[PDB]
Amino acid sequence: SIMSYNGGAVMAMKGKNCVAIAADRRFGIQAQMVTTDFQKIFPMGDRLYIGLAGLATDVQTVAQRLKFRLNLYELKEGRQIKPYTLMSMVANLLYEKRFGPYYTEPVIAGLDPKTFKPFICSLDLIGCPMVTDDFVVSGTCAEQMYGMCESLWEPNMDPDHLFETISQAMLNAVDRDAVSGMGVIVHIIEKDKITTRTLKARMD
Amino acid sequence: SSAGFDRHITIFSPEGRLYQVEYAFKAINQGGLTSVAVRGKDCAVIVTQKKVPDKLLDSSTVTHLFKITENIGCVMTGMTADSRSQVQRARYEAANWKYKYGYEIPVDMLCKRIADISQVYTQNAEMRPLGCCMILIGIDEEQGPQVYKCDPAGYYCGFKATAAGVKQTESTSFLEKKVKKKFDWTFEQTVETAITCLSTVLSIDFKPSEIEVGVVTVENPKFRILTEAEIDAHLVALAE
Amino acid sequence: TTIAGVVYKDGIVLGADTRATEGMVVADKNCSKIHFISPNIYCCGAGTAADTDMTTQLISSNLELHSLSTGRLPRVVTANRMLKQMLFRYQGYIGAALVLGGVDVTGPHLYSIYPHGSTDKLPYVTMGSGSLAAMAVFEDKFRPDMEEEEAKNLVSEAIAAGIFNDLGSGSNIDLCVISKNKLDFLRPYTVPNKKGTRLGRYRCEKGTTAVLTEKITPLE
Amino acid sequence: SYDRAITVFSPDGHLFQVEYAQEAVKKGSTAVGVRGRDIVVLGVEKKSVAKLQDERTVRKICALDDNVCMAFAGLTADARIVINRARVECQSHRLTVEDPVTVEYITRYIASLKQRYTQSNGRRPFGISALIVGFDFDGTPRLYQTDPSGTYHAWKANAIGRGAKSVREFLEKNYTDEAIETDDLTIKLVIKALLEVVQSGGKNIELAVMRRDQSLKILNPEEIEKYVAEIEKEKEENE
Amino acid sequence: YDRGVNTFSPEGRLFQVEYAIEAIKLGSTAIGIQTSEGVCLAVEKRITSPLMEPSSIEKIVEIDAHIGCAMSGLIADAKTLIDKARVETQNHWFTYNETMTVESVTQAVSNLALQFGEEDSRPFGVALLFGGVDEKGPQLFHMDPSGTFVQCDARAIGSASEGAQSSLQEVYHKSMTLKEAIKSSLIILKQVMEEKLNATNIELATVQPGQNFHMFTKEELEEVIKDI
Amino acid sequence: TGYDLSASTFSPDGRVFQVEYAMKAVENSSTAIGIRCKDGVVFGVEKLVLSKLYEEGSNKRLFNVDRHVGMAVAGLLADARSLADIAREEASNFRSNFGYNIPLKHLADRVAMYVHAYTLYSAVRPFGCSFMLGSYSVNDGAQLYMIDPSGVSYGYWGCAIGKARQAAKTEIEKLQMKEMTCRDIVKEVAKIIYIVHDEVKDKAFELELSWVGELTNGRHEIVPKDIREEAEKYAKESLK
Amino acid sequence: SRRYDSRTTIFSPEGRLYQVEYAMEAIGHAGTCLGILANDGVLLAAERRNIHKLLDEVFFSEKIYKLNEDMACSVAGITSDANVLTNELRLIAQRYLLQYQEPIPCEQLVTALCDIKQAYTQFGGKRPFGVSLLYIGWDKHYGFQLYQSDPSGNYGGWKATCIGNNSAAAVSMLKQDYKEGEMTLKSALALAIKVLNKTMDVSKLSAEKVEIATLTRENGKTVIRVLKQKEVEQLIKKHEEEEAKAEREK
Amino acid sequence: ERGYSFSLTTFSPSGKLVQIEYALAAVAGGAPSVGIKAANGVVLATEKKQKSILYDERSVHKVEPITKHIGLVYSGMGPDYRVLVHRARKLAQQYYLVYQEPIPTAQLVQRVASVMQEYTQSGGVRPFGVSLLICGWNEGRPYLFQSDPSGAYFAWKATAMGKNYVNGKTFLEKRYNEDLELEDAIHTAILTLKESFEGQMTEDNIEVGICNEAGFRRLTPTEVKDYLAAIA
Structure with missing residues (x-):
C-alpha cells in the first residue's frame, strides 16, 4: 500500500475539559528506518494542533499549504480561527485534489477559542469530515488504536488519567505494530497551558 | 454643464448625469408610435397600432406583438433592430431557463435578466445602449396577471396599467384619470378602456385594421393575438 | 448505510442509519446523512460520503442563491435537474447515491438519483447497501395515502430491519418529516441497541508510564 | 493587451520617444568611468544625499556577475528592472556555456531588450543609459555604454548625465596616455574629472573599482579625501 | 494632430513609410560595387570622439560565409534583421543542404519589412545593401523600408547619395576590375566625408569567387589608402 | 459637430x-x-x-444563395458579395443541422441580426447594402423580403431599390397579385424597367431578370432571357 | 476609438513624467505620517482624516495594516487603491514563506511592490497607484528598518521618514532634532509627540485624532504594539509639562 | 471586447479623480436614506417616491437581503445597484462553500470594496454611482458599513446618504446617542427621513428593514402603517 510506505499513527483523545494528541516519531522507507525526530503534529495557532499521517510528502505539503491559507485567513480577519472553520478549510483543500489525491489522513484536535470546549475530528484522503466525542485515529495501525481507545476510555477525565490512558494506548498499539514505533510524543493541552511529554517507548 | 467627452460616451458629467441614455429615452420617439398595456382582474391586454403607408407592403410581417413563450407575450417600440435583437435575447434566456430550471420562467425574472443585460450595454462605455422600450405581460400562479416594462437604462418595473412610446404624458394622464376611479376590470372593461384610451389620445376613431391586440387570460394562459373580425366586434361594441 | 424515503398523504418521511463503515471496521457510531438543501427540501446520501457531501453543499448553495435571487420558495424539480446534469457531466465517476425530497407548491415530490444521472419519481425509494431489506419491508407493508404515525412507524421498521440484517448498517436511526408548514428533525428516533456496562475497571494510575522529556508552555 | 503603437515616426524622420527619452538621461545624475590598463575604475557624482540618513540603499553602482559592473543615469526604476533582467540573463548564460559571461554579450542583451522594447506595442521606452564595465578573459579592460535607442558603443572614458559636454571636454583636453600609467593616477584622474564636474565636496563622490582579478571594492570616504587633498596639492604645485 | 498609424495619403502614398524614407537620410554613407571578379563594398564609420573606441562600431556584418551586408542610420533595428536573416539562411542550408541565394535572402527579409501593426509596431528605419556570390555570379542587392526590393549594380545610399550616385555614374561601366572599383569607391568616400580619410575612418568588405570569403582585416586598408 | x-x-x-x-x-x-x-x-x-x-x-x-433563394443586390458591391457569402454559410449550417430547406424568415432574421450587429460598435462600419430575398415552397407559398442598411427586415409584394425608387413603385402598385401568373410579370417588369430610367445621363443599359417559383419546380435560376425575348418586342412599343 | 485615449504614459515636452508628478501631488493631500528608527524598537505615527464623532472605531486597527508577523505599514493616498496593494503585498510575503519556510526579508518585499507599481507606470497607460506608503520591519540581517515607497517604483531606506505635504517641515524638524540612535522608548515618542504637536495645526493634540503603533523585539514573539489611548493621553500631558518647562527659558 | 483596454479615470493636474468626484455628485443627487445601529440591531430606512399615482410598491425593493442575516440599501442608481447586489450575492456563497459558515460583514465589505475599486481602475468603464449602507449581526455585535464610489468604506454609529444628507447628519449628531433600542432607532430614523421628504409620507413612501441578532428581518407595510401613528 501507498499508505503503508512510511508507516505512521496519530491518536487524539477528548478528555473532560482538555484534549490530548499523540503520534509516533519513526521515519523511514518501509523496512529501513532513518530518523527518530520526524515531526507529525503541527501547531496552528494557540491551543489548537493538527496531526498528519501517511505519506510524508503530502504531510509536509499539506502542512505548509494549510499554514499558507491559515495565515492568509488570520491576516484578513484579526481574530483567530475556530476549529470547525479549520476542518472545513482542510476539507476544501483536500477536495480540490479530488482526482489528484494527497495521501494523508489529517486529525484535528484543539480547544474552543471562546470557551474551553474541546474538539476532535478526522478526515479521509478525499475530504470526508467526521466529528466524534471520544477519539479519532489515523494511520496504518488503526485497529490496534481502536481496540485501545474503545477499551480504556472514560467520559470525564482529569488530565492525569487522560495522559496515562493515551500513553498506555499509544504504547501498546504501537508495540503491536511493526512499521510504526521508535518513540512517542504526546501533546496534552488545556485552557491555561500546553504540556508536551515524550514517552520511554521501545526503540526496537 | 458638460466636461470632457460626456456628450459622446457613458461617463459622468459635472451635474451627475450621463447623456447617452437620456438621449436614448427619445430614441424611442423616432418610431412615431404609441403602446398601451392594461392589467385587470384575470386578463391582461396589449394594444398597439400599426403604420403601413404602402400598398406594396404586407400586414403579416408588420406585427410588433412577439410571442416570447407559450405564456409570455410582448410588444416593442423604438427602433426595430434593437427590438428584434432584444426579442431573440429574451427567447434565448427563456429557453435557457427551461433547460436549467425545468419549470416555466416567471415574467419578473425575465425582465430582471433583460434589465441586467441592458445595464451591461450601459455599464461599459464602449458598446452602444440599444434604444428600444420593452413591455412584458404574463400570467403567474397565485398572483394572476402581470404587466412589466424594461427600459433602455436597465430599470425594470411593473404596474397596473402602463404606456410608453411617443404621447404618453397624455396617456398616463388619462390612465390616472381612468384607473384610480374605482373601475371594475372585466375582459371588456379592459378591452374597452384600452382601445378608447388610444382613441381619445390620438382622436382617429378608425378601422379594425390598424391596431393589434395581444391578450392573455386565466382561462387560456396561452398568449393570443386577435383576429380582425373580433377586433371589429370590440370596436362596434364600444360604439354607443 | 440504508436510507429510505416515502410519501404519505401530505408530505415526506426520510430515514437514515448512522454507521459510517470504512472498509470492514466501524469508523463512526454517530454520523448524519440527512443534509440541508432548503427550508423545504432535504436530501440523503449513500456510497462515497465526501462526494455526496460536497455535491449536496454545492447544490444547496446554488439553490439558496437562486431562491434569494427569485424571492420565493424553491422547486424540487430544479434540484433534480441540477443534480442530474452535474452527475451526468462527471460521467459516473462521482459516486453519489441520493434521495431527494421536498414539498413545493405542487406538493410532495420524492426523487432518487443513481450516480450516473438516472433519476426516478417514486412514492417510496430505498438506497444504499442494505436498501434491499427496507424495500422488502416497504413492499410488504405499504398502502397509498398513509397517515403520519403510520409512515413514521413504517420507515422506522424498515431501517430497523435493515440494521438487523445488513452488516454495513447499524446505529441509531435518523428521521425527518416535511410538511407544507411543519419541519421536524430529530437526532435519535429509536435507539435499538444498548451496551453492557464494563466488568473491569482497567484504569491506570498517576505515574505508571515512564516519561523522558517534558515541556510546559503557558498561555493567557 | 494594449494594441497601440506608442512610438510613431516624426514628420521629418525622427523617433519622438527615443530622442526625447535621452532628455531624462540628460536630467539625471552625472557618472564617469575610465579604464586603465590593469585596474578599472568608475563612480558616480551628484548623489545629492541629504547628509543625515542611510546610504546603503541609494547605491547607483552594482554588479551582475563577479566579472561585470554597472552604472547608469536617468531615472532609477527602469535601471532596477534592467539590472534584474540582466542578472537573470547572465546567470542563465552561466547555466549553459561554462565561461564567465562576456561583457559584450550582456551589453548586446541589454541593448537588444531596449530596442525590441522601443519597437513593441505600447511599451514606454527606458529613460536610462547604462555603463557596463568588466574585464573578460586574458585581462582585457573594456567599457561600453548604452543609449535609449539600444546602441552599445564602446568607449575609453565616459560622458553622461548632467553637463556631460563639459566632462567630455575636460577628458578631451585630458586625453594623456600618462594619465593611464599608474593605477593611483587613474583613480586620481577620475577624481579630477569629477572635480571638474559639480561641487565635489567629497561626500557625493561614490566610487568603486575592480582590479580585474578581484571583485568590486566600494571605497571608504577618507581615502577619497586624501585623494582630493593630494589633487589640490598638485594644483598648488602647478603654481 | 494624431491620426491612425496605417492611413494612406490624400495624394496616395503612405505617411509612416514616407517618414522612414526620410529617416534614412540622416544615416551614414555606404557604397557597394558589383564587379565580375567579385563584389566589393565600402562604408563610413562616422567617428565622433577620440574617447570612442574605433573598432567596435560595426557597419558591415556577416550574414553567411558568402553573403555580405551593410547598414545605415538606425543600427539596432538593423541588427535584429541581420540576426533573423542569418537564422533563416541557416534554416535554408539545413533543410536544403545548399546555399540560399541573396535574392531569396532579401525576399525572406522583405516579407516582414512591412508587417507593422497593432494586432498579430512601427516600420523599420534602415536601408540595406546586400552582397555576395551565389550561382548567378556576383550579386549586389538593395532593399528599403518599404519592401521595394530591387537589384542595383552599384548603389549609393544615405546622406550623400546624390553626388555619390552622380559621380559613381561618371566612373562606372560594366567591365570594371576589383581594386579599381575599390579605389574608385574610396575616392567618392573622401569626396563625401567630412573628416580626413585615414586608417580608422572607413572599412571594406569584398567577397570573390576566388577570394572565397569576405575577408578584410585592418592595415591592408593602409596599403590601399597610400596608393591614392 | x-x-x-x-x-x-x-x-x-x-x-x-x-x-x-x-x-x-x-x-x-x-x-x-x-x-x-x-x-x-x-x-x-x-x-x-x-x-x-x-x-x-x-x-x-x-x-x-440557396437552391430556392437568391439575392437581388444594389449598393456597394463587395459588401453585397460578403453578405451573400454569409447567407450561403448560414443556409449551409441550417441544411447541415436540421436537414431541410431554410425558411425565408429565419434566413432574413439571421442576416438582419448580422447587419444590426455590425451597426452596434465603433470598430466596424455599417453595411452599404440593400438587397432583396425571394423564395417559393409548396407548403409556404411566395415570400419576398428586403433588408435595409440598418437591419430592418420585413416583407412586401413589390419593392424597388436604387435611384428611381418611388417612380419604380408607382406602377408596381398598378399591378395585382392574385390574378397574375409570373410569365406575364416577366414582361411587365421588363417593360417598366425599359420605361423608367431614361437615356439622359447614361446611354446604354442592360437588363437582368431572376426568376423563381412553381414553374421552376422549386429551383432558382436566371431566365433564358434570349428565349422569348419578351422585354424588347414590347419595350420598343412602350415609347408611345 | 483612439481620440478617447488619455495617454497616461507618454513623455511630455517638458522633460518629466506628467502623470507621475500628478500622482505625487495626489499623495501630498489627505495625509501625514512618519516613523522613528532608533534602536531596540520602531514606531509609526498617523493622523485621523475622518475624525468625525459618529464613527465606530471597531476595527481594532486604523491606517496600520499588520501585514505579516513582523511588518506593518502606514499609508497615505487613495485608500482602497492601497487596500488592493496591501492584499497583494501580504499575499507576496505569504507565498515567500510558503516557498522557503523562513520569514520574508523586508527589501525584496519592498522591491516586489515597487516593481508592481513600476509595471503599471510603464506599459499600457493605466491609472497609476497613487499611494505612497511606509514600512516597518525586522530581519535576520539588520534588525530594524524603515522604507519609503513612491508611486514611481523608487524606494529608499530612511531613518525617519516623510509622506505628507504637511510633513516636509517635519523633516526639517527631524533634522533640527536629529539624534544618534538613542531609543529610550520615551524620548523618541516624546519627539514624535512634539513633531505632530507642532506640524499639524490642530491646537493641543487631542489623542483621538492621532495614532502611534510600535514594534518591539522579543525572542519568540516579535510583538507589534498598537498601543491604546491612555498612554497617549499621559504622553501628551507629559509633553505639555515639558513645553512649560522648556519655556521657562524666557 | 475591442481591445482598447484604457481607463478613462485619470488624475487631474490638481491631483484629483474628476470622474470619482462626479460619481459622488451623482450619488448626492439620488434618493435619500438613513441607517442607524442601536445596540441590539441595525435599522435601515429609505425614501421611495413613485413618480405618479399609477405605480405599484410591491415590485421594486430597496431593502434587499444578502444572506439570512445581512441587509443592504443604497442611495444612487438602481440599475447599477442591482448588478453589484447580484455580485455580492454570488460572492457570499463562495465563502459559504469554503468555510461552511456565514460570511462576516467585514469580509463582505472587504471583498465588495475590492471589486468596486478594481472596477474603478480597469479599462474604459465608468465607476458605479452607488453608495451602499451594509449591515448585519455577526458574532453578537452588529455592524454598519457605508461604502462610496471611490471604493473606500467606513463604519458609522448612524449616518445618512442622499438629498440633504448634511441636514440629516446634523440632526443625527443632535438626536443619536450611545444606547438605544430598535424602536427608538426607528423613531429617530423616521424623524430624520421626515426631515427631508415631502409632506405626505405613508406606509408606501418609506421602506424599512431591520436586523436582529436572531437574524435579518424585512418589515412589511403593515408594521410600517402601524408605526405611522404619532409620526416621527
Missing part, C-alpha cells in the same frame, strides 16, 4: 447619422426591383453600359 463620426454615438435629437449616411449610399446605385405573383417571385436589375467597361456576364447583382 463631433456626432457624425462614430457608429456608436447618438445625436442631440437621438438618431445615428452613420446609418443615415449608409442608407443614402445605396441611393446612388442604379435600380433593383422585385415582385411576386401567386406562384412565384420575379427579380430584375437594371445594369448600365457606359461604352465597353466589361463583358456581358461579369459582377451580376442577381446572386443565388
Whole structure:
C-alpha cells in the first residue's frame, strides 16, 4: 500500500475539559528506518494542533499549504480561527485534489477559542469530515488504536488519567505494530497551558 | 454643464448625469408610435397600432406583438433592430431557463435578466445602449396577471396599467384619470378602456385594421393575438 | 448505510442509519446523512460520503442563491435537474447515491438519483447497501395515502430491519418529516441497541508510564 | 493587451520617444568611468544625499556577475528592472556555456531588450543609459555604454548625465596616455574629472573599482579625501 | 494632430513609410560595387570622439560565409534583421543542404519589412545593401523600408547619395576590375566625408569567387589608402 | 459637430447619422426591383453600359444563395458579395443541422441580426447594402423580403431599390397579385424597367431578370432571357 | 476609438513624467505620517482624516495594516487603491514563506511592490497607484528598518521618514532634532509627540485624532504594539509639562 | 471586447479623480436614506417616491437581503445597484462553500470594496454611482458599513446618504446617542427621513428593514402603517 510506505499513527483523545494528541516519531522507507525526530503534529495557532499521517510528502505539503491559507485567513480577519472553520478549510483543500489525491489522513484536535470546549475530528484522503466525542485515529495501525481507545476510555477525565490512558494506548498499539514505533510524543493541552511529554517507548 | 467627452460616451458629467441614455429615452420617439398595456382582474391586454403607408407592403410581417413563450407575450417600440435583437435575447434566456430550471420562467425574472443585460450595454462605455422600450405581460400562479416594462437604462418595473412610446404624458394622464376611479376590470372593461384610451389620445376613431391586440387570460394562459373580425366586434361594441 | 424515503398523504418521511463503515471496521457510531438543501427540501446520501457531501453543499448553495435571487420558495424539480446534469457531466465517476425530497407548491415530490444521472419519481425509494431489506419491508407493508404515525412507524421498521440484517448498517436511526408548514428533525428516533456496562475497571494510575522529556508552555 | 503603437515616426524622420527619452538621461545624475590598463575604475557624482540618513540603499553602482559592473543615469526604476533582467540573463548564460559571461554579450542583451522594447506595442521606452564595465578573459579592460535607442558603443572614458559636454571636454583636453600609467593616477584622474564636474565636496563622490582579478571594492570616504587633498596639492604645485 | 498609424495619403502614398524614407537620410554613407571578379563594398564609420573606441562600431556584418551586408542610420533595428536573416539562411542550408541565394535572402527579409501593426509596431528605419556570390555570379542587392526590393549594380545610399550616385555614374561601366572599383569607391568616400580619410575612418568588405570569403582585416586598408 | 463620426454615438435629437449616411449610399446605385405573383417571385436589375467597361456576364447583382433563394443586390458591391457569402454559410449550417430547406424568415432574421450587429460598435462600419430575398415552397407559398442598411427586415409584394425608387413603385402598385401568373410579370417588369430610367445621363443599359417559383419546380435560376425575348418586342412599343 | 485615449504614459515636452508628478501631488493631500528608527524598537505615527464623532472605531486597527508577523505599514493616498496593494503585498510575503519556510526579508518585499507599481507606470497607460506608503520591519540581517515607497517604483531606506505635504517641515524638524540612535522608548515618542504637536495645526493634540503603533523585539514573539489611548493621553500631558518647562527659558 | 483596454479615470493636474468626484455628485443627487445601529440591531430606512399615482410598491425593493442575516440599501442608481447586489450575492456563497459558515460583514465589505475599486481602475468603464449602507449581526455585535464610489468604506454609529444628507447628519449628531433600542432607532430614523421628504409620507413612501441578532428581518407595510401613528 501507498499508505503503508512510511508507516505512521496519530491518536487524539477528548478528555473532560482538555484534549490530548499523540503520534509516533519513526521515519523511514518501509523496512529501513532513518530518523527518530520526524515531526507529525503541527501547531496552528494557540491551543489548537493538527496531526498528519501517511505519506510524508503530502504531510509536509499539506502542512505548509494549510499554514499558507491559515495565515492568509488570520491576516484578513484579526481574530483567530475556530476549529470547525479549520476542518472545513482542510476539507476544501483536500477536495480540490479530488482526482489528484494527497495521501494523508489529517486529525484535528484543539480547544474552543471562546470557551474551553474541546474538539476532535478526522478526515479521509478525499475530504470526508467526521466529528466524534471520544477519539479519532489515523494511520496504518488503526485497529490496534481502536481496540485501545474503545477499551480504556472514560467520559470525564482529569488530565492525569487522560495522559496515562493515551500513553498506555499509544504504547501498546504501537508495540503491536511493526512499521510504526521508535518513540512517542504526546501533546496534552488545556485552557491555561500546553504540556508536551515524550514517552520511554521501545526503540526496537 | 458638460466636461470632457460626456456628450459622446457613458461617463459622468459635472451635474451627475450621463447623456447617452437620456438621449436614448427619445430614441424611442423616432418610431412615431404609441403602446398601451392594461392589467385587470384575470386578463391582461396589449394594444398597439400599426403604420403601413404602402400598398406594396404586407400586414403579416408588420406585427410588433412577439410571442416570447407559450405564456409570455410582448410588444416593442423604438427602433426595430434593437427590438428584434432584444426579442431573440429574451427567447434565448427563456429557453435557457427551461433547460436549467425545468419549470416555466416567471415574467419578473425575465425582465430582471433583460434589465441586467441592458445595464451591461450601459455599464461599459464602449458598446452602444440599444434604444428600444420593452413591455412584458404574463400570467403567474397565485398572483394572476402581470404587466412589466424594461427600459433602455436597465430599470425594470411593473404596474397596473402602463404606456410608453411617443404621447404618453397624455396617456398616463388619462390612465390616472381612468384607473384610480374605482373601475371594475372585466375582459371588456379592459378591452374597452384600452382601445378608447388610444382613441381619445390620438382622436382617429378608425378601422379594425390598424391596431393589434395581444391578450392573455386565466382561462387560456396561452398568449393570443386577435383576429380582425373580433377586433371589429370590440370596436362596434364600444360604439354607443 | 440504508436510507429510505416515502410519501404519505401530505408530505415526506426520510430515514437514515448512522454507521459510517470504512472498509470492514466501524469508523463512526454517530454520523448524519440527512443534509440541508432548503427550508423545504432535504436530501440523503449513500456510497462515497465526501462526494455526496460536497455535491449536496454545492447544490444547496446554488439553490439558496437562486431562491434569494427569485424571492420565493424553491422547486424540487430544479434540484433534480441540477443534480442530474452535474452527475451526468462527471460521467459516473462521482459516486453519489441520493434521495431527494421536498414539498413545493405542487406538493410532495420524492426523487432518487443513481450516480450516473438516472433519476426516478417514486412514492417510496430505498438506497444504499442494505436498501434491499427496507424495500422488502416497504413492499410488504405499504398502502397509498398513509397517515403520519403510520409512515413514521413504517420507515422506522424498515431501517430497523435493515440494521438487523445488513452488516454495513447499524446505529441509531435518523428521521425527518416535511410538511407544507411543519419541519421536524430529530437526532435519535429509536435507539435499538444498548451496551453492557464494563466488568473491569482497567484504569491506570498517576505515574505508571515512564516519561523522558517534558515541556510546559503557558498561555493567557 | 494594449494594441497601440506608442512610438510613431516624426514628420521629418525622427523617433519622438527615443530622442526625447535621452532628455531624462540628460536630467539625471552625472557618472564617469575610465579604464586603465590593469585596474578599472568608475563612480558616480551628484548623489545629492541629504547628509543625515542611510546610504546603503541609494547605491547607483552594482554588479551582475563577479566579472561585470554597472552604472547608469536617468531615472532609477527602469535601471532596477534592467539590472534584474540582466542578472537573470547572465546567470542563465552561466547555466549553459561554462565561461564567465562576456561583457559584450550582456551589453548586446541589454541593448537588444531596449530596442525590441522601443519597437513593441505600447511599451514606454527606458529613460536610462547604462555603463557596463568588466574585464573578460586574458585581462582585457573594456567599457561600453548604452543609449535609449539600444546602441552599445564602446568607449575609453565616459560622458553622461548632467553637463556631460563639459566632462567630455575636460577628458578631451585630458586625453594623456600618462594619465593611464599608474593605477593611483587613474583613480586620481577620475577624481579630477569629477572635480571638474559639480561641487565635489567629497561626500557625493561614490566610487568603486575592480582590479580585474578581484571583485568590486566600494571605497571608504577618507581615502577619497586624501585623494582630493593630494589633487589640490598638485594644483598648488602647478603654481 | 494624431491620426491612425496605417492611413494612406490624400495624394496616395503612405505617411509612416514616407517618414522612414526620410529617416534614412540622416544615416551614414555606404557604397557597394558589383564587379565580375567579385563584389566589393565600402562604408563610413562616422567617428565622433577620440574617447570612442574605433573598432567596435560595426557597419558591415556577416550574414553567411558568402553573403555580405551593410547598414545605415538606425543600427539596432538593423541588427535584429541581420540576426533573423542569418537564422533563416541557416534554416535554408539545413533543410536544403545548399546555399540560399541573396535574392531569396532579401525576399525572406522583405516579407516582414512591412508587417507593422497593432494586432498579430512601427516600420523599420534602415536601408540595406546586400552582397555576395551565389550561382548567378556576383550579386549586389538593395532593399528599403518599404519592401521595394530591387537589384542595383552599384548603389549609393544615405546622406550623400546624390553626388555619390552622380559621380559613381561618371566612373562606372560594366567591365570594371576589383581594386579599381575599390579605389574608385574610396575616392567618392573622401569626396563625401567630412573628416580626413585615414586608417580608422572607413572599412571594406569584398567577397570573390576566388577570394572565397569576405575577408578584410585592418592595415591592408593602409596599403590601399597610400596608393591614392 | 463631433456626432457624425462614430457608429456608436447618438445625436442631440437621438438618431445615428452613420446609418443615415449608409442608407443614402445605396441611393446612388442604379435600380433593383422585385415582385411576386401567386406562384412565384420575379427579380430584375437594371445594369448600365457606359461604352465597353466589361463583358456581358461579369459582377451580376442577381446572386443565388440557396437552391430556392437568391439575392437581388444594389449598393456597394463587395459588401453585397460578403453578405451573400454569409447567407450561403448560414443556409449551409441550417441544411447541415436540421436537414431541410431554410425558411425565408429565419434566413432574413439571421442576416438582419448580422447587419444590426455590425451597426452596434465603433470598430466596424455599417453595411452599404440593400438587397432583396425571394423564395417559393409548396407548403409556404411566395415570400419576398428586403433588408435595409440598418437591419430592418420585413416583407412586401413589390419593392424597388436604387435611384428611381418611388417612380419604380408607382406602377408596381398598378399591378395585382392574385390574378397574375409570373410569365406575364416577366414582361411587365421588363417593360417598366425599359420605361423608367431614361437615356439622359447614361446611354446604354442592360437588363437582368431572376426568376423563381412553381414553374421552376422549386429551383432558382436566371431566365433564358434570349428565349422569348419578351422585354424588347414590347419595350420598343412602350415609347408611345 | 483612439481620440478617447488619455495617454497616461507618454513623455511630455517638458522633460518629466506628467502623470507621475500628478500622482505625487495626489499623495501630498489627505495625509501625514512618519516613523522613528532608533534602536531596540520602531514606531509609526498617523493622523485621523475622518475624525468625525459618529464613527465606530471597531476595527481594532486604523491606517496600520499588520501585514505579516513582523511588518506593518502606514499609508497615505487613495485608500482602497492601497487596500488592493496591501492584499497583494501580504499575499507576496505569504507565498515567500510558503516557498522557503523562513520569514520574508523586508527589501525584496519592498522591491516586489515597487516593481508592481513600476509595471503599471510603464506599459499600457493605466491609472497609476497613487499611494505612497511606509514600512516597518525586522530581519535576520539588520534588525530594524524603515522604507519609503513612491508611486514611481523608487524606494529608499530612511531613518525617519516623510509622506505628507504637511510633513516636509517635519523633516526639517527631524533634522533640527536629529539624534544618534538613542531609543529610550520615551524620548523618541516624546519627539514624535512634539513633531505632530507642532506640524499639524490642530491646537493641543487631542489623542483621538492621532495614532502611534510600535514594534518591539522579543525572542519568540516579535510583538507589534498598537498601543491604546491612555498612554497617549499621559504622553501628551507629559509633553505639555515639558513645553512649560522648556519655556521657562524666557 | 475591442481591445482598447484604457481607463478613462485619470488624475487631474490638481491631483484629483474628476470622474470619482462626479460619481459622488451623482450619488448626492439620488434618493435619500438613513441607517442607524442601536445596540441590539441595525435599522435601515429609505425614501421611495413613485413618480405618479399609477405605480405599484410591491415590485421594486430597496431593502434587499444578502444572506439570512445581512441587509443592504443604497442611495444612487438602481440599475447599477442591482448588478453589484447580484455580485455580492454570488460572492457570499463562495465563502459559504469554503468555510461552511456565514460570511462576516467585514469580509463582505472587504471583498465588495475590492471589486468596486478594481472596477474603478480597469479599462474604459465608468465607476458605479452607488453608495451602499451594509449591515448585519455577526458574532453578537452588529455592524454598519457605508461604502462610496471611490471604493473606500467606513463604519458609522448612524449616518445618512442622499438629498440633504448634511441636514440629516446634523440632526443625527443632535438626536443619536450611545444606547438605544430598535424602536427608538426607528423613531429617530423616521424623524430624520421626515426631515427631508415631502409632506405626505405613508406606509408606501418609506421602506424599512431591520436586523436582529436572531437574524435579518424585512418589515412589511403593515408594521410600517402601524408605526405611522404619532409620526416621527
